[PDB]
Design a protein around this ligand. Structure first.
Ligand SMILES: O=C(NC[C@H]1CN(c2ccc(N3CCOCC3=O)cc2)C(=O)O1)c1ccc(Cl)s1
Ligand SMILES: [Ca+2]
Ligand code: NA
Lengths: 231, 51
RNA sequence: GAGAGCCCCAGCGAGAAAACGGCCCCGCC
């Protein structure tokens, strides 16, 4: 995350970290249930093999309530393409159930129509992760408030096609954005002190560049696919 | 209805037979008042953790 | 909306050194 703040104790308990063979974090995830993690499809092409860490906040100091879960099942969206990053979504089923505790709790899946009318129409959402702090990876979990950006502005701003499975969030010139390493992580929207999954960190042209935004997988278009993928 | 302050619902609001209907995400129960959402267990979805 | 042709299919099926088309989600006359 570029700019933003640290996640303080218990503030981002739905954050998951995908970790490769050398225990290096490379992508984020969002805890949905005891067995299921939401992530980006393109994150499945970064590491040879990986596990999911949850309940982590400072990677440098591994003492506390962190736990690494092995992935039983990967459920990538059949329509994902790396040429466009369209359908940038996957669901991981874990071999072992997550024990919810301090810093380990799922984000809520909203109903679609309500999500569209009530969450997507909010001023801002919250993105989080362990990724780089400029365009390089944070040792501490960070969060950032990102304004929703209208589709027409987003499309004009972009060098790549913005599909209906994507939305923009962040700032025109202000040096705040997600970055490399945050992909697959949570974009959640707050409504009366309850946080609902609204996006997946997908891609951006660099990080915090002027006249560019963060591109997120529009979770509302995938709520049905998610339900299916959670059995 | 649902455009007037979410129909007074804590979470989901839907318009049904000219009337508001509130509902809640899995892991919540609808309160007696038909509007508030009540956690069933200690770690309900979407809540920042305190202990 | 519907029907069809194809494309996709790391989920449930089936099969053959564990990203290798019957069904759920899903795309493109
Ligand atoms: O990971 C990010 N970017 C870091 C890196 C990744 N990246 C980047 C990666 C892919 C694509 N795209 C665009 C979609 O078609 C395929 C493709 O190739 C564009 C940019 C880039 O230019 O820098 C992000 C920045 C903001 C958000 Cl939100 S995610
Ligand atoms: Ca730690
Ligand atoms: Na920007």
């Amino acid at each position: 995350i570029v700019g933003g703040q640290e996640c303080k104790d218990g503030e981002c308990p739905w954050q998951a970290l995908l970790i490769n063979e050398e225990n290096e974090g490379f992508c984020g995830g969002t805890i949905l249930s005891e067995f299921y993690i939401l992530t980006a499809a393109h994150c499945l092409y970064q590491a040879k093999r990986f596990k999911v860490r949850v309940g982590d906040r400072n990677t440098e100091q591994e003492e506390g309530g962190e736990a690494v879960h092995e992935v039983e099942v990967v459920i990538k969206h059949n329509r994902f393409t790396k040429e466009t990053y369209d359908f940038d979504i996957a669901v991981l089923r874990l071999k072992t159930p997550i024990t919810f505790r301090m810093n380990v709790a799922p984000a809520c899946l909203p109903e679609r129509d309500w999500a569209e009318s009530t969450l997507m129409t909010q001023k801002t959402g919250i993105v989080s992760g362990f990724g780089r702090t400029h365009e390089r990876q944070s040792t501490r979990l960070k969060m950032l408030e990102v304004p929703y950006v209208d589709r027409n502005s987003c499309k004009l701003s972009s060098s790549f096609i913005i599909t209906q499975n994507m939305f923009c969030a962040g700032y025109d010139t202000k040096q705040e954005d997600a970055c490399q390493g945050d992909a697959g992580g949570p974009h959640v929207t707050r409504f009366k002190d309850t946080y609902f999954v609204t996006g997946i960190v997908s891609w951006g042209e660099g990080c915090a560049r002027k006249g560019k935004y963060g591109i997120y997988t529009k979770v509302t278009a995938f709520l049905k696919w998610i339900d299916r993928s959670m059995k | 209805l649902c455009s007037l302050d979410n129909g007074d619902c804590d979470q989901f609001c839907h318009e049904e037979q000219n009337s508001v209907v509130c509902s809640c995400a899995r892991g919540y129960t609808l309160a007696d008042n038909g509007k508030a959402c009540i956690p069933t267990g200690p770690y309900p979805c979407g809540k920042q953790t305190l202990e």
